[PDB]
Amino acid sequence: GMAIAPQQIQERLKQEQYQKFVVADIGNFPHCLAQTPEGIASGQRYQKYSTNSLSRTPPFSQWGAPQLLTPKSAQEYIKFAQQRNKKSSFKIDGEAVRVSECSNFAYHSAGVLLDDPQIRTQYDVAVIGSMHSNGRYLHNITLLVPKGSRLPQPPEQLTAEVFPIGTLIVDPWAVGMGHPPEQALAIPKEQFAYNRSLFPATVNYQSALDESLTSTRTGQLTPYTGTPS
């Protein structure tokens, strides 16, 4: 039968409620913040988080101010999603606090996607540094590439002419920043909120090159919410 469709992948990512995260660097990127109810809410949520004493306790302290992190195995991405979805006593507006930012948020979605068995047989997963600025890549993004694809490896850059047909972009930070799923969660580049800063990019992880992938269990994650009927 048919493989898993973009719509079902997007629905799986919607279950994570990425718009509800505390986006710890929201104040650094006003130009990336959508004027939507979600964007307004995210701005206010960060205000409440930032000066709450619990934001300066682990792991919140570390989630809000990350050291360079470059996961190189599928299981690390799955664990990243699992750890960020743990609910602790720290709540804002009655909602358990989860925290991420422009660099590492994409790792959560890489874990969600790597944990799905029907994604495994239809797409390879990659994680790229994007939003290039003065030799730095400010923003990591997750990609779904059709099976068979090999993206350039550093120091070669990823550009449009080596971006495979059928690639889907996954950017949970964009959703934290108020953009809708249709601009961020498993969509083509023409639909992507930050499509003028997508290229050039650097490819930091390719599941197609990860020898540990096959022994990485699927179904490890519980979706953060269940889709409403």
Residue numbers in the entry: 0 to 228
What does the paper say about this structure?
Among all bacterial pathogens, Legionella pneumophila maintains the largest known set of translocated substrates, delivering over 300 proteins to the host cell via its Type IVB, Icm/Dot translocation system. In at least nine instances, this regulation is direct—a hallmark of an emerging class of proteins called metaeffectors, or “effectors of effectors”. Through detailed structural and functional analysis, we show that metaeffector activity derives from a diverse range of mechanisms, shapes evolution, and can be used to reveal important aspects of each cognate effector's function. After release into the host cell, translocated bacterial substrates (effectors) regulate one another through several different functional interactions: indirectly, through counteracting modification of a shared host target, or directly through either steric complex formation or direct modification of one effector by another.
Despite no identifiable sequence similarity, the overall fold of the N‐terminal domain of RavJ resembled that of papain‐like cysteine protease family members. Comparison of RavJ with its top structural homolog, human tissue transglutaminase (TGM2), identified three conserved residues (C101, H138, D170) along with another adjacent residue (W172) as a putative catalytic site. The N‐terminal structure contains a structurally conserved putative catalytic triad (C101/H138/D170). To determine which of these structural elements are essential for effector function, we tested the effect of their ablation on yeast growth. Strikingly, single substitutions in each of the four N‐terminal catalytic site residues, as well as the C‐terminal loop mutant, abrogated the yeast growth inhibition of RavJ. While expression of full‐length RavJ showed a severe growth defect in a spot dilution assay, mutation of each of the putative catalytic residues or the adjacent W172 to alanine fully relieved toxicity as did substitutions in the conserved C‐terminal motif.
